[PDB]
Amino acid sequence: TPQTTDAPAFPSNRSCPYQLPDGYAQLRDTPGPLHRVTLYDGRQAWVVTKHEAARKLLGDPRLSSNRTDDNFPATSPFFEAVRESPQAFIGLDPPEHGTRRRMTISEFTVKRIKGMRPEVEEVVHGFLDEMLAAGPTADLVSQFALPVPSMVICRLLGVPYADHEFFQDASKRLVQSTDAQSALTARNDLAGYLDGLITQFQTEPGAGLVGALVADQLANGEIDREELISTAMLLLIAGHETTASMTSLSVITLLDHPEQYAALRADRSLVPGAVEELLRYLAIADIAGGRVATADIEVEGQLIRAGEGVIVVNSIANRDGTVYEDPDALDIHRSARHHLAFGFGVHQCLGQNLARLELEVILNALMDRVPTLRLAVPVEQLVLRPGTTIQGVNELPVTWHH
Numbered sequence: 001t002p003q004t005t006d007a008p009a010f011p012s013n014r015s016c017p018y019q020l021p022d023g024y025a026q027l028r029d030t031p032g033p034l035h036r037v038t039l040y041d042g043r044q045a046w047v048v049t050k051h052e053a054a055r056k057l058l059g060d061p062r063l064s065s066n067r068t069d070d071n072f073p074a075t076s077p078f079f080e081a082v083r084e085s086p087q088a089f090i091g092l093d094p095p096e097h098g099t100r101r102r103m104t105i106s107e108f109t110v111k112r113i114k115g116m117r118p119e120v121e122e123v124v125h126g127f128l129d130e131m132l133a134a135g136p137t138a139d140l141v142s143q144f145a146l147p148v149p150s151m152v153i154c155r156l157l158g159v160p161y162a163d164h165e166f167f168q169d170a171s172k173r174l175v176q177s178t179d180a181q182s183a184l185t186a187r188n189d190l191a192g193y194l195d196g197l198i199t200q201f202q203t204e205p206g207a208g209l210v211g212a213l214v215a216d217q218l219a220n221g222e223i224d225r226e227e228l229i230s231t232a233m234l235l236l237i238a239g240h241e242t243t244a245s246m247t248s249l250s251v252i253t254l255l256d257h258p259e260q261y262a263a264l265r266a267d268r269s270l271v272p273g274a275v276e277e278l279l280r281y282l283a284i285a286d287i288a289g290g291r292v293a294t295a296d297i298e299v300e301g302q303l304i305r306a307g308e309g310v311i312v313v314n315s316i317a318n319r320d321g322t323v324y325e326d327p328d329a330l331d332i333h334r335s336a337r338h339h340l341a342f343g344f345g346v347h348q349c350l351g352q353n354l355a356r357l358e359l360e361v362i363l364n365a366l367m368d369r370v371p372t373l374r375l376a377v378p379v380e381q382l383v384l385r386p387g388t389t390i391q392g393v394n395e396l397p398v399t400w401h402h
């Protein structure tokens with residue numbers, strides 16, 4: 001009995017850190033902007049598998065971001081936790097979405113990211129000093145990839161870095177949770193911590209975004225205390241986990257393309273372009289594109305009906321050969337313009353330029369301070385996270401010149 005299905009199981013896991021899962025390359029190859037998939041609980045949904053339809057759909061207000069909707073395309077138990085938990089603005093639609101997002105934008109402006117560059121370099125070179133002095137081998141993840149953006153986002157938010165063991169652990173448990181209870185637990189841990197910080201700030205105003213939200217919006221009744229907790233938690237978790245994942249994966253990927261990595265070292269003006277290429281190619285938040293239709297939507301002769309789930313899969317859309325010639329080839333010299341690693345439209349990544357600055361600084365610093373960096377293990381021995389979470393590795397053994 002043939003087992004071929006026209007709604008394959010989704011998501012799928014990467015077998016190579018920088019290549020689409022076999023299932024996804026297949027989805028990519030099927031003509032038409034949309035394909036049926038079967039989600040973990042048996043329910044069916046659409047995935048968007050082409051670049052222009054991804055942009056169009058991400059821009060269509062008929063696709064809601066409400067993750068508490070009964071028909072939201074839950075991809076794992078994490079989403080069961082999401083569905084019964086309070087929502088940050090990532091799960092809101094206009095006009096509510098804008099009123100919350102605009103409370104946070106001031107920290108992420110181009111001018112502000114510019115003026116973070118000296119601070120990001122200090123943090124990066126700080127953790128490099130320590131790692132290089134500490135041993136001849138290291139886990140790049142715990143010793144460098146994670147602490148750097150952790151310290152940077154903590155200062156932006158006004159979250160004390162002194163508490164980093166606690167909130168880094170809770171962030172991991174939440175984002176990488178495989179069951180709903182573990183996710184709810186990690187969320188509750190972070191929420192109680194952030195609640196304490198809020199009270200503290202009400203007594204003694206504090207620095208950072210959390211400090212400003214407490215002194216301004218909360219005091220005016222413009223945000224709920226619970227919403228402020230959700231907002232700070234989103235930025236705190238996004239701020240840690242995304243750039244950390246890009247760092248480890250970029251290192252693995254560049255070391256597998258030595259000719260391009262050498263070109264990069266020889267001409268640092270190539271770094272911003274290389275960062276855009278690595279973003280396109282690694283697409284680490286590739287299912288952070290879930291939606292539910294609130295009205296019927298016609299998509300090139302296919303119909304998304306009201307109440308149906310839609311996942312905009314940006315890793316697949318980033319490998320659209322009609323936009324990126326030889327899409328599965330890493331090319332730090334290509335134009336990776338218009339890529340969807342950060343989404344598109346009203347929910348386009350708030351932190352995108354912070355992430356870009358961090359990755360530029362990091363790559364330049366590794367090339368400068370540790371040009372002999374190499375993996376301490378074969379790529380094959382690394383353990384990749386599953387396709388239900390942010391892509392990456394939890395451990396990355398590295399070594400360098402003895």
Ligand code: HEM
Nearest residue numbers: 089090235238239242243285341342343347349350351355
């Ligand atoms: C390092 C690479 C990063 C990638 C690939 C990435 C990816 C994405 C994607 C695909 C979305 C769209 C979600 C959707 O449409 O539902 C998003 C939204 C978001 N990101 Fe990023 N992100 C990154 C870094 C960051 C950083 C460093 C922050 C710091 C706070 C951040 C904060 C956010 C927030 C708050 C949203 C929600 C935006 C909204 O709903 O209006 N991200 N991200």
